[PDB]
Structure formats: C-alpha cells, structure tokens
Amino acid sequence: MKVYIIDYGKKLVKLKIAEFTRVGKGVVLDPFAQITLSNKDKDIVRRIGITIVDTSWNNTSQSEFKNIRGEHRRIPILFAGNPIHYGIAYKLSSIEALIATLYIVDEVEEAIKLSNVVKWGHTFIELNKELLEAYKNKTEEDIKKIEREII
DSSP states (O other): OOEEEEOOOHHHHHTTSEEEOSSOOSEEEOTTOSSBOOTTSHHHHHHTOEEEEOOOTTTOOGGGTTTOSSEEEBOOSOBOOSTTTTTOBSOOOHHHHHHHHHHHTTOHHHHHHGGGSSTTHHHHHHHSHHHHHHHTTOOHHHHHHHHHHHO
C-alpha cells in the first residue's frame, strides 16, 4: 500500500516504500486517537494508504497529531521487537507500526515482506504473533477487549 510520512525515518523513504507529505492521507496512526485500528480501516488503507508521524512515544504530544488530515487510529497493545526497546509496550518504531497495521487490516502477507526490510522485523512479529493473530481481521471491540486483558 501507499505510505506517507510527516516530518517537522530514512529507511522506508530510501526503500521506495514511503514518501514525505505535508498533508495527512489515508489512515493516520495516532496514539492519541480514541478510535482503535480495525477491519473497517481496511479499504481506506488499500485505496488511500497510511500516514506516519515521525516521533517517539515518550516525547510526543497531541499538539503534533491534532490537526493532521485523515482518519485517526491508535494501535492496540504490542511490544517492540527492535534491539533498542525490546519487550517494552507501545514503544513501536515506524516500520513496526507499519507491520502491525498491515497485519491487522487482513494483510498479514505483506506484514512479512516489510519485516525483512530490517533484520529484527522477524523478531517483532514472532514476539507478538498470535497477539497479532488475535488482532487480525477482527472488529475494533473484539480487538480492544484483548488489549485490556494483557494489561
């Protein structure tokens, strides 16, 4: 699918997968969003795409997500599989949030090809795989109750 990035993430841009933008497009991954990503954002992702705001979980605020154009969705609980934040909840990198999004929108197939862009992409998947499987192609409410259980 198409991937966009808002910057005030060199990898995805170098690898032809993403481009920069000033205006949000498609589904905007937003930790401050009330609506959780589900199987209803599936066709928006396929036709329009995914917008990423390049930032950290710790020092971000809602001010940099607030007026971004597009459909705002948060990602359910997941654990970073990168060698820097391994095991820590919610602290996903840009490529991990992409892998997660693709998995949940019933596109597990491409969550794999993207996971080979980085050497630890495989680690992130198998660390959360049936968490990802329990998330895949499920409705938001079905996805959200599970998120509450793990906590």
